[PDB]
Write a protein that binds this ligand. Structure first.
Ligand SMILES: NC(=[NH2+])NCCC[C@@H](N)C(=O)O
Ligand SMILES: O=C(O)CCC(=O)C(=O)O
Ligand SMILES: [Fe+2]
Length: 308
């Protein structure tokens, strides 16, 4: 078996989806414009029916850590070289695939971005940046990107994180782990459900159903409340259990994954960057089931969050 739910497009389905994305790229100026933001969820209804059925049904299954869609064609010649920085990463070659990711995303919920992250962009970029190999951000490489809940610090964090692989020639693995429910004892579990952790006022790591908890943790940034040694020991145990159950998902060129940000943490294995124009490159997007949950952080009329 596999801990994620997987769908493979037929060449015909893939072609139709790509064709729809190209039409959108033709008619709208940008993915993040107010117009396409509002229309994309409706335009997505024109995607291949088998895909729409998968996305509607798989989202409601209780078990998977992510929804994975394989088989979108990507032409390296048409795509062009991997950008050196996210600033200049909205290349014409990657433009139709950015529109494609937002269409798929519209089947799962409401897309949004952060004012403090990549200039408030909704479709963002994951690529190695020279000089930043050993950082704690997605533009790292030689240092493994440790497992984490996306934007764990915030209550406005995404329900789903979407990743579309534009290229990944060396097969660098994304990492994933669910709640280690098969090994967490009930005392530790109880403590993880209490507001005794920092990620700043204290908050909980686990919430909701005890037989299927939601997760809010960051391998690097999580800490116990000052002096709380029971909270500390629970977090220590959780680290070692997550470290031991961490598994690999390789997003090959054209693969899209929608990681369940409440069920699973994720990261990326260390890799040696090339810096020759064909480095691993993903497009990325935050999705929430309910945009109104974060109405505090609404900058204004935009879909870009910014609290104080
Ligand atoms: N490294 C770590 N444990 N946590 C921070 C991850 C930041 C990543 N989502 C980003 O760069 O957008
Ligand atoms: O590179 C990856 O596959 C993971 C990227 C990631 O964790 C992120 O951008 O939030
Ligand atoms: Fe992440």
């Amino acid at each position: 078996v596999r801990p994620w739910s997987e769908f493979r497009l037929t060449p015909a389905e893939a072609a139709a989806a790509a064709a729809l994305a190209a039409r959108c790229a033709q008619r709208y100026d940008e993915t993040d414009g107010p117009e396409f933001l509002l229309d994309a969820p409706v335009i997505a209804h024109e995607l291949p029916r088998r895909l729409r059925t998968f996305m509607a049904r798989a989202r409601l299954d209780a078990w998977p850590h992510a929804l994975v869609v394989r088989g979108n064609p990507v032409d390296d010649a048409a795509l062009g070289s991997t950008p050196v920085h996210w600033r200049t990463a909205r290349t014409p070659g990657s433009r139709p695939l950015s529109f494609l990711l937002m269409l798929y995303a519209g089947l799962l919920g409401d897309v949004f971005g952060w004012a403090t992250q990549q200039d408030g962009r909704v479709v963002t970029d994951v690529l190695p940046i020279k000089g930043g190999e050993h950082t704690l951000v997605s533009s790292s490489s030689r240092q493994e990107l440790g497992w984490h809940t996306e934007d764990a610090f915030s209550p406005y964090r995404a329900d789903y994180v979407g990743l579309l692989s534009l290229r990944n020639p060396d097969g660098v693995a994304t990492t994933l782990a669910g709640v280690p429910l098969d090994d967490l004892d009930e005392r530790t579990l109880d403590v993880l459900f209490q507001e005794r952790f920092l990620i700043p006022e204290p908050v909980a790591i686990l919430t909701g159903h005890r037989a299927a908890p939601h997760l809010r943790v960051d391998g690097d940034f999580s800490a116990p409340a000052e002096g709380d040694e029971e909270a500390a020991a629970a977090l220590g145990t959780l680290r070692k259990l997550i470290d031991a159950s961490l598994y690999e998902l390789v997003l090959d060129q054209g693969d899209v994954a929608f990681i369940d940000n409440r069920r699973a943490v994720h990261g990326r294995r260390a890799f040696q960057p090339r810096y020759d124009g064909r480095d691993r490159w993903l497009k990325r997007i935050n999705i929430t089931r309910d945009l109104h949950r974060s109405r505090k952080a609404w900058a204004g009329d935009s879909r870009v969050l910014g609290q104080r």
